[PDB]
Amino acid sequence: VESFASMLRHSPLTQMGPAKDKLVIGRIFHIVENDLYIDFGGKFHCVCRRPEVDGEKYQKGTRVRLRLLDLELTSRFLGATTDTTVLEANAVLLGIQ
């Protein structure tokens, strides 16, 4: 039986290291107008605008490639005791496949 420490060490979100500028495949799972709600693994989903070029090749299930800038996107402000999470990650859609 594998221990949770083993599960973690040999895992791909623990071999990714710092999320910034790491290319990642994701799957569109919801579309509102032109906001594509994609995944990429991770705890949160990213939301990206519809790329107008090839702008019908982005449907529910399409595998896309994302740059990834953040995995949770949060910040503390003036009087706050905790962080203001947007419950969403931050990525830039490069294209398909």
Binding site: E2, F4, M7, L8, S11, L13, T14, G17, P18, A19, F29, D39, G41, G42, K43, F44, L71, E72, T74, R76, T82, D83, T85, L87
Partner: protein, 217 residues
């Protein structure tokens, strides 16, 4: 003598074999270990957090496994003894899933705006002789302003046991069976719905089996 269909499961440990529905691998692939950042933590969730990876906290999945065993055992026993299990959430991305899960089982779901006094001014709000739930299971303990849900306090005020998935930014304080785990990922929430639905359905079918056996006996 019906104190053998209401006392027997209570001396068999794991009377419903609920230990074979979840493993630390099943949870890891459901992404239960992934938590929030050190900046959205809670002092009372600190005992359940394995550590922090790249300022992103992770939850100890062995502790999640033990807590989930205890939680699913309790849920199975209340569903067997024919309680009322109310599933409460305020997600908005999983409301459809929780109400459909209640309807596929036979339990109940509050996924909408909790009106003040639902469990507390209950006789005036519903009717003089209402049976309040005998177990409230929160799939997401926080409301939409990222604060603890009124029901967690009012369930305790009204002495209703509570099972709840507590993420890193949550207060595992007034929750009888807290289950340290991710509730922000569709795979995690889907696995929780699947596990609770399976427990409740197996519990009710086993209750029918023992009632049939004693009726024939």
């Amino acid at each position: 003598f019906n104190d053998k269909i209401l006392n027997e499961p209570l001396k068999h440990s794991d009377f419903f074999n609920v230990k074979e529905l979840f493993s630390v691998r099943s949870l890891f692939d459901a992404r239960v270990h992934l938590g929030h950042k050190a900046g959205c933590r809670h002092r009372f969730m600190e005992p359940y957090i394995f550590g922090s990876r790249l300022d992103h906290d992770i939850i100890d999945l062995e502790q999640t496994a033990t807590h989930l065993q205890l939680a699913l055992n309790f849920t199975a026993h209340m569903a067997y003894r024919k309680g009322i299990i109310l599933f409460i959430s305020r997600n908005r991305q999983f409301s459809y899933l929780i109400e459909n899960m209640a309807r596929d089982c036979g339990e109940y779901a509050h996924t909408r705006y909790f009106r003040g006094g639902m469990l507390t001014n209950a006789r005036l709000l519903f009717g003089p002789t209402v049976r309040l739930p005998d177990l409230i299971i929160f799939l997401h303990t926080l409301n939409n302003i990222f604060e603890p849900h009124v029901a967690v306090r009012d369930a305790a005020k009204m002495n209703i046991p509570t099972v709840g998935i507590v993420d890193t930014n949550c207060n595992p304080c007034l929750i009888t069976y807290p289950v340290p785990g991710n509730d922000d990922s569709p795979l995690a929430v889907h696995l929780y719905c699947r596990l609770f639905q399976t427990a409740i359905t197996r519990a009710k079918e086993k209750r029918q089996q023992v009632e049939a056996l004693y009726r024939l006996q």
